[PDB]
Write a protein that holds these residues in place. Structure first.
Motif, PDB file in Angstrom:
ATOM      1  N   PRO A  48       0.817  -1.208   0.000  1.00  0.00           N
ATOM      2  CA  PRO A  48       0.000   0.000   0.000  1.00  0.00           C
ATOM      3  C   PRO A  48       0.854   1.263   0.000  1.00  0.00           C
ATOM      4  CG  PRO A  48      -0.090  -1.071   2.161  1.00  0.00           C
ATOM      5  CD  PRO A  48       0.702  -1.971   1.252  1.00  0.00           C
ATOM      6  N   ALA A  49       0.264   2.362  -0.447  1.00  0.00           N
ATOM      7  CA  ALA A  49       0.952   3.647  -0.513  1.00  0.00           C
ATOM      8  C   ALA A  49       1.333   4.150   0.882  1.00  0.00           C
ATOM      9  CB  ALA A  49       0.069   4.670  -1.203  1.00  0.00           C
ATOM     10  N   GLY A  50       0.820   3.467   1.904  1.00  0.00           N
ATOM     11  CA  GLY A  50       1.108   3.820   3.282  1.00  0.00           C
ATOM     12  C   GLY A  50       2.585   3.775   3.605  1.00  0.00           C
ATOM     13  N   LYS A  51       3.327   2.954   2.873  1.00  0.00           N
ATOM     14  CA  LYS A  51       4.761   2.813   3.101  1.00  0.00           C
ATOM     15  C   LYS A  51       5.512   2.859   1.780  1.00  0.00           C
ATOM     16  CE  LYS A  51       3.937  -0.768   2.442  1.00  0.00           C
ATOM     17  NZ  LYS A  51       4.727  -1.773   3.206  1.00  0.00           N
ATOM     18  N   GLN A  52       4.769   2.894   0.690  1.00  0.00           N
ATOM     19  CA  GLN A  52       5.348   2.889  -0.633  1.00  0.00           C
ATOM     20  C   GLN A  52       5.492   4.323  -1.132  1.00  0.00           C
ATOM     21  OE1 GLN A  52       2.956   4.320  -3.401  1.00  0.00           O
ATOM     22  NE2 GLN A  52       1.973   2.318  -3.383  1.00  0.00           N
ATOM     23  N   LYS A  53       6.731   4.737  -1.339  1.00  0.00           N
ATOM     24  CA  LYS A  53       7.018   6.077  -1.816  1.00  0.00           C
ATOM     25  C   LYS A  53       7.434   6.049  -3.269  1.00  0.00           C
ATOM     26  CE  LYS A  53       5.567   8.098   0.296  1.00  0.00           C
ATOM     27  NZ  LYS A  53       4.821   9.339   0.626  1.00  0.00           N
ATOM     28  N   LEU A  54       6.962   7.028  -4.013  1.00  0.00           N
ATOM     29  CA  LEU A  54       7.269   7.129  -5.422  1.00  0.00           C
ATOM     30  C   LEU A  54       8.076   8.392  -5.671  1.00  0.00           C
ATOM     31  CD1 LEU A  54       3.683   6.237  -6.647  1.00  0.00           C
ATOM     32  CD2 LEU A  54       5.505   4.723  -5.852  1.00  0.00           C
ATOM     33  N   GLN A  55       9.295   8.216  -6.130  1.00  0.00           N
ATOM     34  CA  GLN A  55      10.208   9.327  -6.313  1.00  0.00           C
ATOM     35  C   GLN A  55      10.415   9.639  -7.790  1.00  0.00           C
ATOM     36  OE1 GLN A  55      14.762   8.872  -5.655  1.00  0.00           O
ATOM     37  NE2 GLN A  55      14.116  10.345  -4.100  1.00  0.00           N
ATOM     38  N   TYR A  56       9.927  10.787  -8.213  1.00  0.00           N
ATOM     39  CA  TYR A  56      10.079  11.220  -9.590  1.00  0.00           C
ATOM     40  C   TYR A  56      11.163  12.255  -9.680  1.00  0.00           C
ATOM     41  CZ  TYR A  56       9.124  13.653 -13.987  1.00  0.00           C
ATOM     42  OH  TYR A  56       9.235  14.249 -15.223  1.00  0.00           O
ATOM     43  N   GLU A  57      12.226  11.883 -10.369  1.00  0.00           N
ATOM     44  CA  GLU A  57      13.374  12.750 -10.569  1.00  0.00           C
ATOM     45  C   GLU A  57      13.957  13.221  -9.239  1.00  0.00           C
ATOM     46  OE1 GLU A  57      14.456  13.346 -14.093  1.00  0.00           O
ATOM     47  OE2 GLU A  57      13.388  11.492 -13.628  1.00  0.00           O
ATOM     48  N   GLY A  58      13.807  12.389  -8.216  1.00  0.00           N
ATOM     49  CA  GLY A  58      14.365  12.699  -6.916  1.00  0.00           C
ATOM     50  C   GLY A  58      13.354  13.333  -5.982  1.00  0.00           C
ATOM     51  N   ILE A  59      12.093  13.351  -6.392  1.00  0.00           N
ATOM     52  CA  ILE A  59      11.052  13.989  -5.610  1.00  0.00           C
ATOM     53  C   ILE A  59      10.055  12.950  -5.134  1.00  0.00           C
ATOM     54  CG2 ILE A  59       9.509  15.972  -5.521  1.00  0.00           C
ATOM     55  CD1 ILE A  59      10.636  16.777  -8.296  1.00  0.00           C
ATOM     56  N   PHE A  60       9.925  12.801  -3.823  1.00  0.00           N
ATOM     57  CA  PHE A  60       8.911  11.915  -3.268  1.00  0.00           C
ATOM     58  C   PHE A  60       7.528  12.486  -3.525  1.00  0.00           C
ATOM     59  CE2 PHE A  60      11.869   9.931   0.141  1.00  0.00           C
ATOM     60  CZ  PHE A  60      12.345   9.046  -0.807  1.00  0.00           C
ATOM     61  N   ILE A  61       6.926  12.040  -4.610  1.00  0.00           N
ATOM     62  CA  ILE A  61       5.613  12.518  -5.006  1.00  0.00           C
ATOM     63  C   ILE A  61       4.532  11.883  -4.138  1.00  0.00           C
ATOM     64  CG2 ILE A  61       6.556  12.629  -7.333  1.00  0.00           C
ATOM     65  CD1 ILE A  61       5.426  10.201  -8.062  1.00  0.00           C
ATOM     66  N   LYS A  62       3.421  12.584  -3.983  1.00  0.00           N
ATOM     67  CA  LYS A  62       2.346  12.123  -3.123  1.00  0.00           C
ATOM     68  C   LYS A  62       1.042  11.995  -3.900  1.00  0.00           C
ATOM     69  CE  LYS A  62       1.798  16.923  -1.776  1.00  0.00           C
ATOM     70  NZ  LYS A  62       2.239  17.940  -0.787  1.00  0.00           N
ATOM     71  N   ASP A  63       0.067  11.337  -3.282  1.00  0.00           N
ATOM     72  CA  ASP A  63      -1.241  11.073  -3.894  1.00  0.00           C
ATOM     73  C   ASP A  63      -1.945  12.375  -4.274  1.00  0.00           C
ATOM     74  OD1 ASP A  63      -4.355  10.945  -3.294  1.00  0.00           O
ATOM     75  OD2 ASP A  63      -3.846   8.857  -3.697  1.00  0.00           O
ATOM     76  N   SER A  64      -1.629  13.434  -3.539  1.00  0.00           N
ATOM     77  CA  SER A  64      -2.279  14.729  -3.724  1.00  0.00           C
ATOM     78  C   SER A  64      -1.772  15.433  -4.985  1.00  0.00           C
ATOM     79  CB  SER A  64      -2.040  15.611  -2.493  1.00  0.00           C
ATOM     80  OG  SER A  64      -2.782  16.816  -2.564  1.00  0.00           O
TER      81      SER A  64
END
Length: 86
Positions: A48-64
């Motif tokens: 789940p996104a609860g612990k899964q971080k997505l980093q775009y070009e070095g940026i931890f992007i969020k659901d928002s």
């Protein structure tokens, strides 16, 4: 749409998810958002996104945020990483 990728972390036995260091390749319109990425990974691997971080070009992007927000054009390389190992 645009071509987006998710760098899966190398966690073959380090966890129960399908993470093996490979790269996921999806295609989504710039109009979609990170919310679609986090959920699709949660479905694919299990995490789940609860612990899964997505980093775009070095940026931890969020659901928002969205793909357009970060200007994820064709060839957006996202990096999947576990938020906190513990």
């Amino acid at each position: 749409p645009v071509s987006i990728k998710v760098q899966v972390p190398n966690m073959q036995d380090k966890t129960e998810w399908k993470l093996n260091g490979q790269v996921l390749v999806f295609t989504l319109p710039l109009t979609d958002q990170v919310s679609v990425i986090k959920v699709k990974i949660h479905e694919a691997t299990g995490m789940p996104a609860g612990k899964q971080k997505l980093q775009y070009e070095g940026i931890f992007i969020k659901d928002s945020n969205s793909l357009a927000y970060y200007n994820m054009a064709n060839g957006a390389v996202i990096h999947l990483a576990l938020k906190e190992r513990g």
